[model samples]
Target: SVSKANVPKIDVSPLFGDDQAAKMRVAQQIDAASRDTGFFYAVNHGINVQRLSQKTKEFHMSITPEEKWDLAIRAYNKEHQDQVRAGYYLSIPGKKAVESFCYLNPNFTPDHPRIQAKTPTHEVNVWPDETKHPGFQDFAEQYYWDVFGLSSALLKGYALALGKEENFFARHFKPDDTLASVVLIRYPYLDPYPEAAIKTAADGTKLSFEWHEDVSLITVLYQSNVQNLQVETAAGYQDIEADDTGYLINCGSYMAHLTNNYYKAPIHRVKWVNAERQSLPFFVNLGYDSVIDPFDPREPNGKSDREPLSYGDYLQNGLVSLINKNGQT
Candidate 1:
C-alpha cells in the first residue's frame, strides 16, 4: 500500500482567494512541477460539485449503448472512414469493452488542413443528435464553459509559475478562438491477466493503459472512486487517490515546448479491472489554424527548438493511425 504522506498535494485555492502570497505559492508549484513531474493533484479548485454530479447523472441516464455505437458508426461513415473514430471503447482487444462519449462544440472541425499534423491528434468527436439526446446540448455547453474557465484559471497560475505575466496564456486563447473537447469514459472491471498481455489500458489498475503523453497544453481529469488512474513518478507508477476533490492536471508535449523542455510530459496510463469506473477528461487546445511555438519575441526567427504545428494536422494524422490500428474506418 502507498502512504498518502508521500504523495504531493497541490493547493490552488489561492487563485480564488485574494491572498497574494497564497497565489504565489500556487504559481511556484505550477512552475516547479509543470516540467519536472508533468502531473499534479489540484485542491481547492472552484468546481461546482453539485452541478458536476447533476450532469454526470443526467449523462448516464441519457446516453445508451445503441446511441453510443450509432454515433461512432456515423462519425466513421461521415468521414468516409470505415472504423470508429472516437467514441466508447479505445479499439483495444481482450478487455471488457465499456461505453464512452466524445462531445465537442460544432465550431471545431478536424477536417481543416491548418491544424498541426503532429500534436493535437484526435478524430473529430462524434456528437449525438440533440433531438435524440434531449438536454444534451444544454448540459454539454455549460460543461464546456465550466471546464474552459477552469483551464483559464490554471493557465494563469502556470504563467505566474513560469515567471510570465498573469495573463500570458490568455492573450493567445480567446473564448471564441480556441478548440476544446471533453471525453466521458466509463471503464469496467476485469480479471487479472499477464501485465504484459494487454496492449491499451485506460485505467491504471487491472489492465494498465500503455505509456503515452498528451498533446494539448494541459489535460484535466475528473475521476470517480476507482483506483485505476496512475501517474509515473521517480519511484514508479503511483495511484491517484479519490479523496482529493480538485481535478488532476497533467502537462503535455505542448507545455514542454512552452517551458523550453524544463517541464517533462509525464507518461501516464489507466488499468482495466472488473470494477466499473467513469471519468471526464477535458482537453484544451489552440484553434485549428493556430501555430504552437516558443514565446521568445527576440528570436522572431520563425523557428525554434520546438517545431511549429497546427491542430488540424495533428487530428488528421491521429485519425489515420486509429483507422489503421482498429480497422474501424
Candidate 2:
C-alpha cells in the first residue's frame, strides 16, 4: 500500500498531535510499515539538512592521507585495547596493511591511555588543524549532538509505535550508557570495471561488502545523489535511490530480538558504481554493558524465548570466534 512516487515521503504528523484520531492514524502507519517493509523514508524527522550536508562535505574534503592514517591507527588501537581488556584477542591489519578501521567500537575518552597505544586503535584521531578546516572540531561535535537528538526522538516514536510509553527506551539510554558512532563514507567515481575491480574479492568477481547485519538497534542513513545502495527483499535485491530530504531507516538484528522478531531486520549492502557516492550512516547502539534479548511477555505461544545477553558478552563471543577461526586464539 506504499506509494511509489518519484520521491515518496511519509509523514507522521499524527504522532505530533494529541487527539485520539491522530494517535490512531499514527498507530496504523506504524503497524503497516513495521510489518511490511521494516524500512522507510522519513521526511519530518527534524534533522537539519543543511548542517548535515555541510559536515559531510567537510569530512570528504578536510583530511589528508596522513591524517586518515592517523585516524585509522587511533581507531584500531582503541578497539584492540578494549578487546584485550575484555579478555578477547583480535588480530587486525596495521598501517602497512590495506585494512580499514572498524569504528563501531572506539575509545571515546580523550585522556584514555589506549588513545596513545602502539596499535592502530591507540592512535589519536587525525583531526584537521583548525586553521585548515576552520571550526572542524566544533562542527563535527555539534553534528554528532544533533544526530543524537534526532535519534532520541525517533526512538521515542518507535516506543509509541510499539504501544509502549513514549519514553520506554530513554531509561536504558542514559547520557553515559550509549556508544553510538557515525561513519561518513565517500566512494569515488571510476570506470565500470575499475569500480568492480576495486571491490572485488579473492574470488575475482566484483565483491560487495561482506554479508553482515548491524548489531545495533537501528541505523539511520542519508544517501548522496548516487545509486549504489541495495536492500535484499523476498522478491529480489531492490535498489535504494536517493531523494532530497529523505533519510532511510533500517532495523537491526538487536532490534529484531528486542521486538521478539516483530520488527524485521532488512539485510542491505552497497555496490560500487561508476558515479561518485557518499553516505552518512549513524548507528545507534546501546551501552556496551546493556543486555539485549527478547523482553516482551505478551507474545502468544510458539513465540520468541526472552533471554538476555549483555552487549559486552555478545561482542566478546563474536571476536573469540573470529580469533579461533584464524588460529589466533
Candidate 3:
C-alpha cells in the first residue's frame, strides 16, 4: 500500500501550452515540490499509453534473461561508458548498473553524424532476430521516441522553474547528447536465501536495487508493472507505487550539482515483490565534456556545494564503487 498523503502530484499540461503565464504558474508549484521531496508525479502528459502496446511490454517482461543473452550485442559495447547497447549485458551483473533487459533506440547508429558532431557514444540498438520476435525492435524504437517527447516537455517545465530560457535546458538534451537513453528494465526476484534487505516493512530479503542517486540531470520514469518502489526522504522511507497519468520525476545528482544543491537528489530504491518487476526510465543529461557545477552557489540564493567538474569526469566516476558495493558476485 503506497501512502499518497505526503508526495505531491502536479499537472504539467501548462508547459505544453504557449501561454507563458501558465507555464510560470506551473513552475511555482514545481519549485515547491523540488525544494523538499525532489519527487513528484505529473498528470495529462501527452504519452499515448495505448500506443506503447501492453502486449509488447508484456512480451519483453516475460522473456527470460537467457533469451536476451542469445541476441548479438552491438560492436561498441564497452564498460565504464553509459551506453548499454541492446542485449542482456548479464555476464558482469555486479558492474552493470543492474542486470536488466535494455534495448536502446535504433535510430542513432554508431556511424550517425551526431556521434562526430557531439560525441560518438551513440550506437544502433541490436535485438533478437526479427524472425523470432516480430515487432520487438520497432516497438522499442517507438517507445524510445515517446519518452523523448515527454522528456523534452519536462525540460521546458524544469527551465521555467529555474527562471532560465526554454532553450537553456533543451540544448542539453539535444539528439547528440548520449546521456539520454531509452531503457526498459526487467528486474526479476532474487533468490530468497540469507537475503539482504529485500522487502519493505518485512524481514529477510535480497535488495532488489541498492539505494543510490541517479547520475543524470533528470530521470523521467513511467509507472512500474507493480508497486514496490521506495524513496528515502528526510521525513523517512516513502513507498512510490505507480500512477498511470504522469511520470515519476526525480532530480538526479547531476541536476543537483547543476542547480547548486537547491534541488536535492532524493535517494531511492526498489524492494523485492517476490516476483519480477519492470519499469521504463529515460535518463537525460548534458554533453560529456561540458563543465558541470558551472553556476555559482552564492547566486539565486542557490546552494551549490559540489566542486567544479566536467560532465565527462563526473560520469567517468559516477559508479565510484557501485559495482563492487552491491555485495553480490
- What are the Cα lDDT values of the candidates? 0.62, 0.56, 0.64
Q: Native-vs-model 1 lDDT? A: 0.62
Model 3 TM-score (2 dp): 0.79
lDDT of 1 by residue, 1-329 (tens): 53221235688777766787787899888766665556677777777755665666576556665665566644433542532334544323353254456665444455544223433433455556778767766777677887787888888788777667777765656565566667776554545533443455433235434556775677887877666666677777676566436788887666666656666677766655556566788876766666655653225442356566565565456446544544331
Which residue pairs of candidate 3 clash? 196-205, 260-303, 260-304
Which rank order by TM-score, best down to worst? 3, 1, 2
Structural similarity to truth (TM-score) of each candidate:
0.75, 0.73, 0.79
**Model 2's lDDT to the true fold?**
0.56
Error of 2 at 301 (Å): 8.4
RMSDs, each prediction?
Answer: 5.5, 6.6, 4.7
- Candidate number of the best lDDT: 3
The parts of candidate 1 lying over 4 Å away from their true place are 1-7, 16-21, 73-96, 106-132, 189-208, 295-304, 311-329
Candidate 2 lDDT, 1-329, residue by residue in tens:
21221223556544555675665555556556666656667677777776767766665655566554334431344633333321111222221111221233334445644343433222233344678668866765676666667667567667777776766665565444455656665554443334323455333424335334565677777777776666666765556667658777767777777777788777665554655556677777666567744655356442466677665455446445544542231
List where candidate 3 sits over 4 angstroms from the true fold.
1-5, 50-56, 61-67, 72-86, 90-99, 105-107, 113-122, 188-206, 296-308, 319-321, 327-329
Across 1-329, the per-residue lDDT of candidate 3 in tens digits comes to 34432467888888877999988888888778888677888778888765553744666655655565464243224442434344554424333333444554454665766554644444455566666667867777777777777778878888778877776677766655555665566555545422333433343333567677887778888755577677876656677757755688888887777776767788877766656555677777566666644453348655455577777567656644444554331
